[PDB]
Amino acid sequence: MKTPITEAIAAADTQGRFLSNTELQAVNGRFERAAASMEAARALTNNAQQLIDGAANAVYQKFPYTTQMQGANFASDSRGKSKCARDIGYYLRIITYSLVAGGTGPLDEYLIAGLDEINRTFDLSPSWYVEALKYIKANHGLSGQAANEANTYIDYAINALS
Amino acid sequence: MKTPITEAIAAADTQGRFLSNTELQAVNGRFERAAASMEAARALTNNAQQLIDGAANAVYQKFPYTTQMQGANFASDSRGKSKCARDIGYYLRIITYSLVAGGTGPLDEYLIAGLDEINRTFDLSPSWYVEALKYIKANHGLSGQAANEANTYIDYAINALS
Amino acid sequence: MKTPITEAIAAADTQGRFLSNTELQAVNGRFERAAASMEAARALTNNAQQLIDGAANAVYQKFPYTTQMQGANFASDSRGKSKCARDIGYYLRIITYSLVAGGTGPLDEYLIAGLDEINRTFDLSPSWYVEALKYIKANHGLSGQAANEANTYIDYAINALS
Amino acid sequence: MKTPITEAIAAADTQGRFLSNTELQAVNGRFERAAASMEAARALTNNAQQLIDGAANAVYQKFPYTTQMQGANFASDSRGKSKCARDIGYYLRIITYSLVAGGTGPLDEYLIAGLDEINRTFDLSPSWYVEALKYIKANHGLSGQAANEANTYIDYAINALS
Amino acid sequence: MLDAFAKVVSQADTKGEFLSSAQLDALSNVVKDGSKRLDAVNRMTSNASTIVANAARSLFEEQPQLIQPGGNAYTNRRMAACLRDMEIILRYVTYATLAGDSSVLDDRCLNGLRETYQALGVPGGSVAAGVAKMKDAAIAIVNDPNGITKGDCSALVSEIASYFDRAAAAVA
Amino acid sequence: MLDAFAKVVSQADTKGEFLSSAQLDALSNVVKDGSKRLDAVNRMTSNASTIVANAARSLFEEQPQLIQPGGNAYTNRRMAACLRDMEIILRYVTYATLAGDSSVLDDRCLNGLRETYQALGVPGGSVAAGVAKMKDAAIAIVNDPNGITKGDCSALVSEIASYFDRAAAAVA
Amino acid sequence: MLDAFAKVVSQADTKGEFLSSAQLDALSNVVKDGSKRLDAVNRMTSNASTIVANAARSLFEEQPQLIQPGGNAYTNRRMAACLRDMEIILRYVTYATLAGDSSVLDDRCLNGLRETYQALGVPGGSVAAGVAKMKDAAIAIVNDPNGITKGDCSALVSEIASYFDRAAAAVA
Amino acid sequence: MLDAFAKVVSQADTKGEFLSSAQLDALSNVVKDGSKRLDAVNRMTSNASTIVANAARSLFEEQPQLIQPGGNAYTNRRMAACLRDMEIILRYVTYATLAGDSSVLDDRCLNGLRETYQALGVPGGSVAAGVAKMKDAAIAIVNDPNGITKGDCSALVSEIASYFDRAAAAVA
Ligand SMILES: *[C@@H](C)[C@H]1/C(=C/c2[nH]c(/C=C3N=C(/C=C4\NC(=O)C(CC)=C4C)C(C)=C\3CCC(=O)O)c(CCC(=O)O)c2C)NC(=O)[C@@H]1C
Ligand SMILES: *[C@@H](C)[C@H]1/C(=C/c2[nH]c(/C=C3N=C(/C=C4\NC(=O)C(CC)=C4C)C(C)=C\3CCC(=O)O)c(CCC(=O)O)c2C)NC(=O)[C@@H]1C
Ligand SMILES: *[C@H](C)[C@H]1/C(=C/c2[nH]c(/C=C3N=C(/C=C4\NC(=O)C(CC)=C4C)C(C)=C\3CCC(=O)O)c(CCC(=O)O)c2C)NC(=O)[C@@H]1C
Ligand SMILES: *[C@H](C)[C@H]1/C(=C/c2[nH]c(/C=C3N=C(/C=C4\NC(=O)C(CC)=C4C)C(C)=C\3CCC(=O)O)c(CCC(=O)O)c2C)NC(=O)[C@@H]1C
Ligand SMILES: *[C@H](C)[C@H]1/C(=C/c2[nH]c(/C=C3N=C(/C=C4\NC(=O)C(CC)=C4C)C(C)=C\3CCC(=O)O)c(CCC(=O)O)c2C)NC(=O)[C@@H]1C
Ligand SMILES: *[C@H](C)[C@H]1/C(=C/c2[nH]c(/C=C3N=C(/C=C4\NC(=O)C(CC)=C4C)C(C)=C\3CCC(=O)O)c(CCC(=O)O)c2C)NC(=O)[C@@H]1C
Ligand SMILES: *[C@H](C)[C@H]1/C(=C/c2[nH]c(/C=C3N=C(/C=C4\NC(=O)C(CC)=C4C)C(C)=C\3CCC(=O)O)c(CCC(=O)O)c2C)NC(=O)[C@@H]1C
Ligand SMILES: *[C@H](C)[C@H]1/C(=C/c2[nH]c(/C=C3N=C(/C=C4\NC(=O)C(CC)=C4C)C(C)=C\3CCC(=O)O)c(CCC(=O)O)c2C)NC(=O)[C@@H]1C
Ligand SMILES: *[C@H](C)[C@H]1/C(=C/c2[nH]c(/C=C3N=C(/C=C4\NC(=O)C(CC)=C4C)C(C)=C\3CCC(=O)O)c(CCC(=O)O)c2C)NC(=O)[C@@H]1C
Ligand SMILES: *[C@H](C)[C@H]1/C(=C/c2[nH]c(/C=C3N=C(/C=C4\NC(=O)C(CC)=C4C)C(C)=C\3CCC(=O)O)c(CCC(=O)O)c2C)NC(=O)[C@@H]1C
Ligand SMILES: *[C@H](C)[C@H]1/C(=C/c2[nH]c(/C=C3N=C(/C=C4\NC(=O)C(CC)=C4C)C(C)=C\3CCC(=O)O)c(CCC(=O)O)c2C)NC(=O)[C@@H]1C
Ligand SMILES: *[C@H](C)[C@H]1/C(=C/c2[nH]c(/C=C3N=C(/C=C4\NC(=O)C(CC)=C4C)C(C)=C\3CCC(=O)O)c(CCC(=O)O)c2C)NC(=O)[C@@H]1C
């Protein structure tokens, strides 16, 4: 899959040559960032349940009709609320995938591809998930560069919905 | 000019997009190494005269005929010795260019291109300049990553001669 | 293989015609030169051992570090000196091949092809072999056109190293 | 003009290189034969009038009707006999051109091109000129390689008529 | 294109000289501010929509005829084109910011842009005003002290403002 | 191809679960050995000629008929191709060393190499011998404590040795 | 293709040795017969029509049904193709005579000639007959002592005869 | 292109005349000096690097600004280009020397070269000086009495010098 390391190796192999100092400079930039990336991925994975439930509740408070109107696509009953939390879990899960991989690869392949027609078919508003990702971004309890790494990929998923 | 920064910007521009997270990761890898690269460039520029004169004398001791035999391609007189020190100054100067830029660009453009034609025409043995570079590499006085940076670009100029 | 005679025959056959007076003029030029070429090839083959050993010794005297420094690529010990003489023998052997063939064919096919990466991989300086060929050229004991034929192909190998 | 020398120079120029050893071998083959070629050209030019008049008379004896029958394409009067001697002079002149140049170039350009159209239009039997050339070949008085050179270019003009 | 290092090296190669201690100090300053440079570029990028929006809003309040019938920014086609141009100029500004040299912005964006606007009927002065409001919005986003290690970014900020002013002058 | 992180991510996506603490720990360990991984790749790359030369030398000392008339490595044409093969295998081992995963080495170099080698009549056992000689020469260069910060690289060296053993076993 | 010298050089390169005195002597002998070799080629070339005519004449005297209605050489189309075949074989024999080696004759003319001749239904035995007639006519022309320096050409003539026998045996 | 023989033959064909005894004598002189001509061409060729080097050195001592910063021969790119031009002119001089006629040098090298230099900013006078120093170096190498049968080459040497002077005048 497309990661900064496999990208550098692919460029070197295409020209049938060893990795250059510039490619080794780029891989070092990834290995430096990877510490913050791993801390963010560890935090989001550990606090998955609290972040998921808080994100769903933030969407319900923001768009109250999602818990009031009937219809299978809404979250008025227990089945809908559980589907919502499952969805938000899917988003956060693939976000940690990307934090581990050091690139958007997993988000592009596992989440964004076909996401627009899934949401369109089942009448799921993208602004719901944008709000859930906004909550996770403001409640992951990270600081410094680990917060910046998390925010980079959370914003990447937000922009894919907009 | 080709530098790691201009390469990343050119990649983003050809796709008409802002710089991605992976491109910024690569630029960070260059900025991280740039402190050690700038250290090497400063040490080589301050000790330029001492390193140049030492490299020339290293060549004269390794290839004794270059100070003995008559001939315009040899350093058996004052004129030849000035030309030899000048050439070594050219090599080291362009090596500091590459350390400053963060890539082999200046070495490729300002030194290596046409170098084999110059050496062949004027009967300058490339082994002479390999030996001068080997002395500068063994006696620049640097340590740690500043030495590693200086070594990679001196080794690059050595390989261009082989 | 590419010899002046097979070159003339190939040009005639490509146009499906007998050899012209001009092609027969060129082949005569080869047959005239072939007497000096054969004398040179006979001399270098007979005095192979003395020429090889003298060439190796001329390289050792010219570049004294080749017999002083340790390292498998140098000739400090008996194994290195024997490898050096074997190499110089390879050069002279293929040079006599070219003198017999009346063209650079054997030198291009048996020696120069891949020579640059062989020397680069095993850290063998081309200027060593240039000096050995310079000795053989100055000590083959030929005169007139046989000396010129020998010098033509010795200089051809020298230029392939430069 | 196409000569062995201009052919070799054109070959070197199209590859943007100096002349090779094989090209110089070919040019030597032309210079070696040029002494005999120049001998033939001198003998044919000095004995031009005697060879021309003898060749014409050889044709009149071999094809007796050419001096008997009326007709403008025949040599039964003074005008026709002058035209016939002139034509044979043309053939021999251009043959000396080719001997001087060292190749069939002048014969190809100055004589053979259009020759069949000229002979057909004016009803000049090519067998007449084959016979005149056969006389000049049998009676030029040359020996050795000068005769061989003259013969090859006279035979070339004969073959162009057949 | 040139960055700050390649520009200095190209001037030194023409003079045939080693880098002076002045040039070595200047580039060491650029290298020590490299992390701030990344923060600046990443903040302008992550907030490109906000920077364009704040700029367009202030431009349309100042020149309301742009968004009224017959305005050069009226209709969906001209509005989308206008926003695309603002994002384009910002994109090239972030190039020059990461590079430390305006060469990429001058060559691949500003060169001949004035003539392009005068041919299309686009108000160059209005574009220059919009670019200036992009500058103020981008600087405010870059200089936001929240969620970032405190420090002086004033030299960088002056550099970024110079790239914006360069962009504005090429169309005014 | 996959690096160390993409392999774990791809297996967790197949299972549809978050990554466990054991997987996070293993990948965090790879990250903490990042500078050591770069040193190994940089040392194996800049000494690639020395590595191939040392392995070729020892192979030709043990099987001297390879550089004797009739040998599969005799003549300029076959010796240069032998050295080219050595460089290629070492190049792909450095790819795997950087990636932390042998996927690139197996897919693009080792797959079908024995079948081709058998077709060209190249002694696959001698190639596997020279590959094992590269391992010794490459690991000695990697493990050189000169001019480098002292530390334990045994896990990295064992990983690199496994890549060389994979290449050797693919042609043996 | 190979000439006399390339064949010896290629075999010595396979053995990896210098050329012996016996090989140097044999190739020096070829060089001393160089002017004689050129005479043979020049005489076989400039008399190529006479050679083909003499061989064809004697072949059609011995096998008169070839130029009789129904014959494989009757009609203008087949007679011209027969003469063209004669010229081609003689042309390649002169190639071999100049090269001092039959490699060009075997590779580019004789290889697969019997199979084609059998396909087109051309009597291969009659072709081999005419080829042997060319040999007699060509050798008589080569051996003509008129207008040439007297000397022994028996080795050269025997070599040329061997080339004609190779062609004859390739279709017989 | 024309050589000495083709030039004489082309003039005679236009006049429609046999060659005079003057022209036949002149060409017999060229043929008798053919071996010296080959020696001259082969000596200039084998020593092309030395001839260029000696010429460039003397030119750069005479005009030191060429190899100083801002000089037209400074930097690796302009130096390699300058040396390439010197070798080019020498190459075409050796063509005219073997041919005995300057037609190839005039047509395929000198024609329009002046205009090419004035467009590229190359000092035509400096090139003409360099070509003159090539002449002196080549003549010295051609007239070297060591390792060659003694004899008078003065006519040839005058011819070669005329080709060099021709080359110099086309750019001065
Ligand atoms: C000026 C814009 C503001 C400012 C910047 C600032 N940051 C630091 C600290 C850091 N900034 C980074 C940025 C990155 N490294 C990367 O690889 C990437 C892209 C993937 C980015 C965006 C980093 C790594 C650091 C160090 C860790 C930390 O958080 O401290 C400083 C002080 C340290 C320094 O100068 O290097 C400053 C000044 N601070 C302000 O107050 C300005 C508004
Ligand atoms: C003028 C440049 C110098 C000079 C020349 C010179 N040489 C001879 C002798 C010979 N030169 C050759 C040259 C060649 N024949 C070839 O086929 C080739 C290329 C493959 C070359 C280069 C030959 C064959 C000879 C004859 C053998 C011999 O060595 O004598 C002479 C005198 C004989 C003659 O003119 O033909 C001269 C004058 N000598 C000088 O002193 C000038 C400096
Ligand atoms: C939560 C923010 C809001 C919400 C959620 C909701 N979702 C459904 C059903 C589905 N959600 C998905 C999404 C995905 N499936 C995948 O494989 C991936 C890739 C990781 C994604 C993003 C899909 C496909 C469905 C339909 C099929 C299924 O049930 O799995 C419902 C029920 C809708 C229905 O018609 O069944 C709900 C309620 N709705 C709200 O009101 C919340 C605010
Ligand atoms: C010193 C190691 C040995 C040595 C040096 C030497 N050089 C010359 C002349 C030249 N050196 C160059 C090299 C360059 N010029 C460039 O622009 C560049 C790229 C930056 C390079 C690498 C060139 C072009 C020349 C010739 C032109 C000139 O003078 O500048 C000499 C004199 C040679 C002569 O024939 O004039 C010498 C002696 N020789 C030794 O023996 C030293 C060991
Ligand atoms: C002698 C001038 C210097 C010298 C010689 C030396 N060579 C080696 C090893 C090798 N030489 C070759 C060259 C060839 N092999 C071929 O098939 C051909 C084509 C004809 C050539 C030109 C090669 C391939 C090797 C390495 C493999 C082998 O041993 O056969 C050594 C030992 C180096 C080593 O690492 O084993 C030496 C010492 N070194 C000097 O110092 C002399 C001045
Ligand atoms: C002499 C062997 C027999 C002969 C000759 C004859 N020729 C003519 C007229 C012409 N001859 C030519 C030939 C050439 N003109 C060229 O430029 C060239 C190339 C160098 C050649 C070969 C031409 C063109 C003519 C016609 C134009 C002219 O007069 O020049 C005649 C008179 C024919 C007429 O109709 O006027 C004759 C008699 N005829 C014999 O019987 C001789 C045996
Ligand atoms: C917005 C603040 C102002 C404005 C802009 C506007 N532009 C167009 C059309 C074009 N804009 C460009 C600019 C670029 N394209 C590039 O590729 C680059 C460099 C990377 C630049 C700088 C171009 C080329 C055009 C041509 C047509 C197009 O749409 O691409 C319009 C529409 C014009 C029309 O009549 O349709 C507008 C409105 N208009 C305003 O009022 C603002 C002041
Ligand atoms: C040297 C260690 C041994 C040896 C090697 C040898 N190989 C050939 C020919 C080939 N080797 C390859 C291998 C690759 N090409 C690639 O692109 C890749 C990576 C995807 C690999 C692994 C191939 C394809 C060939 C055939 C095509 C070619 O030659 O380039 C030779 C020459 C064989 C010959 O000339 O007939 C040799 C000598 N032989 C030994 O004896 C050493 C043990
Ligand atoms: C194991 C192979 C040997 C070893 C390695 C080692 N290195 C460190 C520290 C560092 N290694 C590097 C190397 C690079 N960074 C890059 O960006 C690049 C390519 C452009 C390279 C080649 C760096 C920068 C460091 C940090 C600074 C330093 O010099 O220490 C350690 C210490 C622990 C750590 O991981 O940092 C070790 C162990 N040392 C040995 O003894 C092993 C033989
Ligand atoms: C004449 C001695 C005998 C004879 C010959 C004959 N051949 C054909 C047809 C062909 N001959 C060839 C031979 C070659 N073509 C080449 O290029 C080469 C060298 C590489 C050779 C040796 C070929 C290819 C053909 C078929 C294609 C063609 O005709 O060009 C014929 C005509 C057969 C027909 O018309 O059906 C004849 C007569 N036949 C005899 O009887 C003589 C004994
Ligand atoms: C054997 C076929 C007959 C024979 C040949 C013979 N020739 C010589 C001498 C020479 N032959 C040539 C021929 C050429 N040189 C060329 O460049 C060309 C093509 C352009 C040809 C055709 C030459 C120049 C000579 C030297 C001068 C001379 O005429 O003698 C000999 C004598 C020994 C020798 O090899 O020189 C012989 C024997 N003579 C016979 O009787 C055989 C029938
Ligand atoms: C060297 C003594 C002087 C000098 C030369 C110089 N030339 C260039 C560029 C060019 N030279 C040529 C000449 C030819 N190319 C051909 O193919 C032929 C005929 C076969 C000729 C005569 C050409 C076409 C060029 C154009 C560009 C190129 O490099 O090919 C330069 C570089 C110019 C630049 O600005 O890069 C130089 C330096 N300069 C001196 O100072 C010497 C006096």
In terms of C-beta density within 10 A (0-12 exposed, 13-18 middle, 19 or more buried), how is residue H44 classed? buried
Q: For residue H133, give every residue at least 6 positions away whose Cβ sits within 8 Å of its Cβ, in sequence order, or none.
A: H54, H55, H58, H59
Chain D residue numbers touching H89 (CB-CB < 8 A): none
Residue A64 DSSP label:
T
CA-nearest of F44, F50, F55, F133 to F94 is: F44
Name the residue ranges covered by the structural domains of chain C: 1-162
Question: D10 CB near a chain H CB, below 8 Å?
Answer: yes
CA-nearest of E27, E24, E12, E10 to B42 is: E24
Task: With beta carbons less than 8 A apart as the criterion, state whether D63 and D128 touch.
Answer: yes
Task: With beta carbons less than 8 A apart as the criterion, state whether G89 and G145 touch.
Answer: no
Instruction: Calculate how close chain A gets to F14, using CA atoms only, in Å.
Output: 10
Q: How far is CA H47 from CA C155, D21, H94, in A?
A: 10, 14, 12
The angle at the Cα of C70, spanning C69 to C76, to the nearest 5 degrees, equals 70
Kindly provide the resolution of this structure in angstroms, with one decimal.
2.5
Residue H169 CB neighbour total at 10 angstroms: 12
- Ligand 9 atom 36, closest CA: F35
Cα–Cα distance for residue pair C120/D73, rounded to 1 Å: 78
Test site for ligand 5: of C81, C96, C122, C123, most ligand atoms within 8 A of the Cβ: C122
Determine the distance separating the centroid of ligand 2 and the alpha carbon of H102, expressed in angstroms.
22
Cα–Cα distance for residue pair E153/E143, rounded to 1 Å: 7
Task: With beta carbons less than 8 A apart as the criterion, state whether G99 and G7 touch.
Answer: no
Cα–Cα distance for residue pair E89/B146, rounded to 1 Å: 38
Q: How far is CA F94 from CA D42, F97, F139, G14, H73, in A?
A: 77, 5, 12, 37, 43
Instruction: Calculate how close chain B gets to H145, using CA atoms only, in Å.
Output: 20
Q: Which H residues, 41 through 100, put their C-beta within 8 Å of a C-beta on chain D?
A: 41-42, 45, 48, 91, 94-95, 98-100
Cα–Cα distance for residue pair H102/H92, rounded to 1 Å: 9
- Please answer yes or no on whether D100 and H8 come within 8 Å at the CB atom: yes
CA-nearest of E45, G163, A5 to F41 is: A5
The angle at the Cα of G137, spanning G132 to G143, to the nearest 5 degrees, equals 120
Q: How far is CA D93 from CA C76, D39, D160, E172, G117, in A?
A: 73, 15, 16, 82, 47
Residue E43 CB neighbour total at 10 angstroms: 18
Q: How far is CA G112 from CA C86, G73, G85, G133, in A?
A: 44, 21, 14, 22
The angle at the Cα of H107, spanning H102 to H109, to the nearest 5 degrees, equals 90
CA-nearest of C49, C58, C47 to C135 is: C58
Structure tokens at E118: 């005068």
Q: Identify the helix (H) or strand (E) that includes residue F101.
A: none
Residues in chain F: 172
Cα–Cα distance for residue pair H57/D27, rounded to 1 Å: 34
Task: With beta carbons less than 8 A apart as the criterion, state whether C81 and C12 touch.
Answer: no
Structure tokens at B28: 């960070």
Cα–Cα distance for residue pair H19/H26, rounded to 1 Å: 11
Determine the residue type at H30: V
Structure tokens at D91: 């053939």
Chain A residue numbers touching F27 (CB-CB < 8 A): 38, 100
Q: Identify the helix (H) or strand (E) that includes residue G170.
A: none
Find tokens 């016996």 and name the residue: G22
Ligand nearest the Cα atom of residue A58? 3
Q: How far is CA H13 from CA D97, E40, H164, in A?
A: 8, 83, 30
The angle at the Cα of E3, spanning E2 to E9, to the nearest 5 degrees, equals 80
Q: How far is CA H126 from CA A25, B5, F32, G167, in A?
A: 46, 41, 62, 65
For chains D and H, CB pairs below 8 A equal: 95
The angle at the Cα of B118, spanning B42 to D18, to the nearest 5 degrees, equals 165
How far is C-alpha H141 from the geometric centre of its chain's CA atoms?
13
- Ligand 2 atom 10, closest CA: H35
Structure tokens at G79: 């007679």
How far is C-alpha F62 from the geometric centre of its chain's CA atoms?
22
